[PDB]
Amino acid sequence: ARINRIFHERFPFELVKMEFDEKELRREISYAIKNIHGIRTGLFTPDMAFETIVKKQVKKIREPCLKCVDMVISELHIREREGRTKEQVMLLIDIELAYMNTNHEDFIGIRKGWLTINNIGIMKGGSKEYWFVLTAENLSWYKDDEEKEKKYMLSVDNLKLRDVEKGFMSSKHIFALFNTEQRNVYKDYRQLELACETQEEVDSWKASFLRAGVYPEMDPQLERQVETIRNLVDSYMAIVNKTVRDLMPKTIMHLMINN
Structure with a gap:
């Protein structure tokens, strides 16, 4: 099991391969603001410009989390347990998308x-x-x-x-x-x-x-709104990575190894 512990501390490496093109993030933030206002006018920055960009990036986490479960099964009834360990990994990501908690360790909470x-x-x-x-x-x-x-x-x-x-x-x-x-x-x-x-x-x-x-040597307002949303997304995705790193080993330990 000293090999398994590497997975629990190799899984963090898979979570940083999820690279993205910055100009695509700015492009999608812009189209998100325009579609959220709708017919109306942009007095204030909408919330869904934040919630829907975050919800989009969080969905990318399903893949590496299911890689981690497969690797641990390689090192180790164990197959029947795989059918239950992976539900709680999907169900933990679904829970991350159900609600946006901005009350802690965030900008609100160069x-x-x-x-x-x-x-x-x-x-x-x-x-x-x-x-x-x-x-x-x-x-x-x-x-x-x-x-x-x-x-x-x-x-x-x-x-x-x-x-x-x-x-x-x-x-x-x-x-x-x-x-x-x-x-x-x-x-x-x-x-x-x-x-x-x-x-x-x-x-x-x-x-x-x-x-x-x-x-x-839109632009004056839209660019400021895009920049504000981008910084808020980064800070909140730092929280989501910490939670995932610290909850995957415990879900696998409880549901598969200890059983």
Whole structure:
């Protein structure tokens, strides 16, 4: 049975092969919102945009759960018991689809790093380094990784993202945050041309800014609704994986091995 225990701790590997294309998840969230409103208008995000995307991904779990039962039967009347152990695995998944419990270990119940300001004003020299935290809502500056100072901030929206021309440092690739409707870019430091340690870091920052909602150098509302639903789905599917990992061995131990 030290082989069986590997299954109970190899089954977690099958549950992470269930890959999906992100742009297909966003596509289905969008069509879900539109079909839920119907003829009406989108004042608030509907619940079924969350419930029906989650219910769709949970149904994918039936397969690996029934693989786990077959593997354990290989290691081990045992056939007649297989007819009863697999009902309780299907019936446990059905129960997961019957009700959506949002009261625990859920949101209801994005990028960090050091950035250097390349352009320095008349009152300062060298370069200015600060600890930067990016969220989907706002930008914040700090003097250290402890994130205690809370001195400068920028809005994710009403802001634009751009690359830079030739002449900027190549050893510390520089991007820029800027506005065109305002002269002062959220306590601007000479157009906020910020250097990173590597070019890959800049690209990752640009991706995070775009995800947050920074405009590159239905859509305004639908994209925010799609993003909100996507994050809520991920957090709730983390719960569903923990429950399945911890309930499969006990269902097999009770119904098959101990009998």
